[PDB]
């Protein structure tokens, strides 16, 4: 019985930044959700609209896997009805989200002495991001009265900000990898079910 390749998502060598969050579509397979529960890496496993036990007994036409990296104290923003810089400007979940949120500490892989600057998050935007939208524009954002023409000044900010992950940083500030599973059920054969 062919299984859903969850390993290609969780054990990916490189994880995309939060602003440019990577989405993989998983379809037409069977997935055993109990390799997830019975693991100790995952510090955060929370579900909305469904119950972990039910997952084995249900079927879904398509499962989406959104993956990215954020700060520890920012994981609380990956939930419906939350606010903050990440939830407002980078990744927003709809109010009726039905799925599970999985996160684990990745300090051994994404930090380096002196700081790892390759991970960025969006810090400025004209309006709040609509749910499941990924704008990756990098134009200069004008925050003050002075008009901006592409030269960063006191009132002309580059919209992206590096995290600067360090190993010395406390657990609250260490990098966490996040994977969001979304369960949509369309009008189509549901070939994602439980293995029983």
């Amino acid at each position, epitope marked *: 019985t062919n299984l859903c390749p969850f390993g290609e998502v969780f054990n990916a060598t490189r994880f995309a930044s939060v602003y440019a969050w990577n989405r993989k579509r998983i379809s037409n397979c069977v997935a055993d959700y109990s390799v997830l529960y019975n693991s*100790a890496s995952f*510090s*955060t*496993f*929370k579900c909305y609209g469904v119950s972990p036990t039910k997952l084995n007994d249900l079927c879904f036409t398509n499962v989406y896997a959104d993956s990215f990296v954020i700060r520890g104290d920012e994981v609380r923003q990956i939930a419906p009805g939350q606010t903050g810089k990440i939830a407002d400007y980078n990744y927003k979940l709809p109010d009726d989200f039905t799925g599970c949120v999985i996160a*684990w500490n990745s*300090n*051994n892989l994404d930090s380096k002495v002196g700081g790892n600057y390759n991970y960025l998050y969006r810090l400025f935007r004209k309006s709040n991001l609509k749910p499941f939208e990924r704008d990756i524009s990098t134009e200069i954002y004008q925050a003050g009265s002075t008009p901006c023409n592409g030269v960063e000044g006191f009132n002309c900010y580059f919209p992206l900000q590096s995290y600067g992950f360090q190993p010395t940083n406390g657990v609250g500030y260490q990098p966490y990898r996040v994977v969001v599973l979304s369960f949509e059920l369309l009008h189509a054969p549901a070939t994602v079910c439980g293995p029983k």
Partner: nanobody
Amino acid sequence: QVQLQESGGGLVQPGGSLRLSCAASGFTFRRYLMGWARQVPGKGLEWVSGIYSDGSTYYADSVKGRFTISRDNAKNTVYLQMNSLKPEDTAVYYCAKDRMDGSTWPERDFGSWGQGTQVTVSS
């Protein structure tokens, strides 16, 4: 707002018993998941054990049998007791306050983190 203090540990012989203790003031301790998490140097955090508000207990395969977790009543201290320690346990242990009330078995969200002490098992 919430403070977690780690007491115990140090240098223990193999097979030694260490009783780790956290005390948390600043929230209603009675109904919140609490757990101990281990960070062996060279790896990420691993969730050893935790206890829910209703006494449901969770252990890891490595520590199953070896460890016991106790949640105190009329006190805000959780106790973690390790026996027959072996070199593989040399690490730092932290305490964690789940961010939602009345959780069940597979729902864990450890937002708050304590300043974990280091446990050394040499000989």
